[PDB]
Symmetry: C2
Subunit: 252 residues, 2 copies
C-alpha cells in the first residue's frame, strides 16, 4: 500500500514487417518507433497526469499480426491499450473504447497502369472473379467477404513490399493478383517506392480512421481523445506526419 | 414502478437558419429533418433495443445557436444527447462522449475568384489584417482567435446565405469581408448556389468531423458509434448524403 507503487500501462503494439514507418520494433528503448508511437507519446505529454507505461510487441515478426486479435487482447485484459495503425471498424468498437481518429483512412484498389482499362475500381474487381491481394492480419479480408461478397478463395494474403510488388507485376494469370485492396496510408507509401507502374483505380470506397484502443469506460481514452484533437488543432499531427511520411518519388 | 413507464431520450437539435439540408426544424413530426437526423434515425434502427426519443429545437430561430452551449446543455443534463452538425473539438470532448464521426469536416477559406491573388489561403488571410466572415455559433470564432492569433474585432458573424454572399461581394473595403472561414460541408453548399463567383483558396487547414454528443459514460454512445460504422461499411452513410446533398450547379 504505502510501499507498493503503481502498475504501468501494458501497451500492445503490432510487430509490423511492412510499412514500418507507421509503427515497428526498435532495437533501442522504448522498443517501438514510428508515426503512431510519436502521436501516442505527444498525446500522453498533453495529459494533466503522468502515465507510467511499457510497450509490448504483438506478432511473430514474420507476418503482420491479426489486428482483430490485438484489439481482443485489450478486451481480454492482456493489454490496457493497443497503440498503432489500428483501423476503427464495427466489430472492434463493440468491446473497446477507441479514441477519436488521429488519421483518416479507407480502402482503395491498386492495379497496374496497363490493367486500368479492365480493373477500374472495386465494382469491376468484384465481378472480375480474379485474385485480390491484401496484407496479413487486416480487417479488409472480412470486409471484402461479408460486405462486397468476394469468394474467400480469391483473397490472397501477401507478406511484405516485395510480395505486394511481385503479385501486382505477375498479375492474375501467373500466380499473382489482378489488384491489391488496402488502406490509402499504406498505398501512399507503396506508390512512392514502385516506380509509377501501379496506381489507385476508382474512388476510396470506405472511410474510417486509425485510433488507440482502450478498455471499455477507460477515463484515459476520453483524455487521449481530447489530446489528439489538441494535437490536430495546434498543427502537431501534420508535423509528426511530415517527420515520418514523405510521398514524393523520382517519377513525380 | 409497475405503472410508471420509461423517460424518453431528450435530444437537443440546433435550430439552423442556414444550410438547413444538414439539420433544421420541420412543421411535421418528428419536428426536425435533414442529413444529420436521417443518420441518427438509421443508427437508432440498427440498435438491438428500442430508444423512445423526443427532439427539442435549440436556438431563437433568428441566428444559428452557440454549438458550444448546445453541447454544455448535454453536460448540464438538460439534454441526454445533442444531434446535428456538431463539430468534434477539444473543449467539447472534455465533458461529453461524442460518437465516432459520421462525416469528415475541416475549415476552408472562401474568397472571390478576383481576390485569389492576395488572399490565397489561411496564412495570407491572417497577415492581411482584413475582416473575416464566420457563421453565428461556430467553434471557428475561438479557433481563429486562440489558434491562428486573429484580433477578435476582425471576426464578423454573418446570419444566413444572403449575408455570406453579400459580405463576400461587398468585400473588405465596403462593409464586407476579405474571406469566409467555415467548414467544407457548408461551403460545398455555398459554392453550389453562388454562380462560380467564389472558390476555396489554399488547403483545408483543420480536420475533424461531426458526431452525436452523449453524456459521459453513456452506453448509448458506444452502440451508436458501432451503428455509425455499420452504416458507413454498408454504404448507407453515402446513400443518406446523396439524398440530402447534391453539389452539382449550372456553371459546372
Ligand atoms: N490497419 C489494419 C492492419 C493492417 C495489416 O493487416 O497489417 C487493421 O487495423 O486491420
Ligand atoms: N458545426 C459548427 C456549427 C456551425 C454554426 O455555427 O452554425 C460547430 O459545431 O461549431
Amino acid at each position: 500500500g504505502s510501499a507498493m507503487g503503481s502498475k504501468p500501462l501494458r501497451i500492445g503494439v503490432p510487430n509490423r514487417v511492412s510499412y514500418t514507418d507507421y509503427v515497428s520494433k526498435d532495437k533501442n528503448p522504448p522498443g517501438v518507433r514510428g508515426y503512431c508511437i510519436d502521436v501516442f507519446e505527444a498525446a500522453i505529454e498533453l495529459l494533466p497526469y503522468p502515465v507510467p507505461r511499457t510497450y509490448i510487441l504483438y506478432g511473430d515478426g514474420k507476418r503482420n499480426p491479426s489486428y482483430d486479435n490485438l484489439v481482443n487482447e485489450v478486451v481480454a485484459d492482456n493489454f490496457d491499450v493497443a497503440v498503432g495503425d489500428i483501423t476503427i471498424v464495427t466489430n472492434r468498437t463493440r468491446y473497446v473504447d477507441f479514441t477519436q481518429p488521429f488519421i483518416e483512412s479507407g480502402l482503395v484498389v491498386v492495379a497496374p497502369v496497363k490493367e486500368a482499362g479492365t480493373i477500374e475500381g472495386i465494382d469491376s474487381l468484384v465481378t472480375s472473379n480474379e485474385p485480390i491481394g491484401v496484407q496479413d492480419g487486416t480487417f479488409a479480408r472480412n470486409y471484402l467477404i461479408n460486405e462486397l461478397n468476394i469468394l474467400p478463395s480469391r483473397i490472397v494474403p501477401l507478406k511484405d513490399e516485395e510480395q505486394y510488388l511481385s503479385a501486382l507485376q505477375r498479375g492474375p494469370n501467373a500466380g499473382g493478383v489482378a489488384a491489391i485492396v488496402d488502406e490509402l496510408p499504406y498505398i501512399e507509401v507503396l506508390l512512392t517506392n514502385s516506380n509509377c507502374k501501379f496506381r489507385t483505380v476508382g474512388q476510396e470506397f470506405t472511410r474510417t480512421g486509425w485510433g488507440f484502443a482502450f478498455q471499455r469506460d477507460s477515463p484515459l481514452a476520453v483524455d487521449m481523445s481530447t489530446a489528439i484533437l489538441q494535437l490536430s488543432e495546434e498543427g502537431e499531427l501534420e508535423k509528426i506526419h511530415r517527420k515520418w511520411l514523405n510521398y514524393k518519388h523520382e517519377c513525380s
